[PDB]
């Protein structure tokens, strides 16, 4: 079906805030990870799931992190505000379960 069952798809993303002002935690309501979680410190180390790699490409972002039912990202500088990022993180992680795409593709 080309239109969504959005009404209650419960993919919509809460933030929790952090013991790091250049780091928030992004809850989206569905376990990313809940058998493991996966790092992505460098743009490089992304390439093991297609999401980190697409939360590379939004404005301010340093490195993604994945853990049970979480995404803690961080940003690259103290000068950036995350009201920058959060519309696109929320738009390319609905995107992403949208898609339907594997959270990661290799370890």
Do not use: C
Not at 58 to 74: A, L, M
């Amino acid at each position: 079906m080309g239109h969504h069952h959005h009404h209650h798809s419960h993919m919509f993303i809460q933030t929790q805030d952090t013991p790091n002002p250049n780091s928030l935690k992004f809850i989206p309501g569905k376990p990313v990870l809940e058998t493991r979680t996966m790092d992505f410190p460098t743009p490089a180390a992304a390439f093991r799931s297609p999401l980190a790699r697409q939360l590379f490409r939004i404005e301010g972002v340093k490195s993604v992190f994945f853990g049970p039912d979480s995404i803690t990202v961080t940003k690259e500088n103290e000068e950036l505000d995350w009201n920058l990022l959060k519309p696109d993180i929320y738009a390319t992680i609905m995107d992403f379960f949208a898609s339907g795409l594997p959270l990661v593709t290799e370890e």
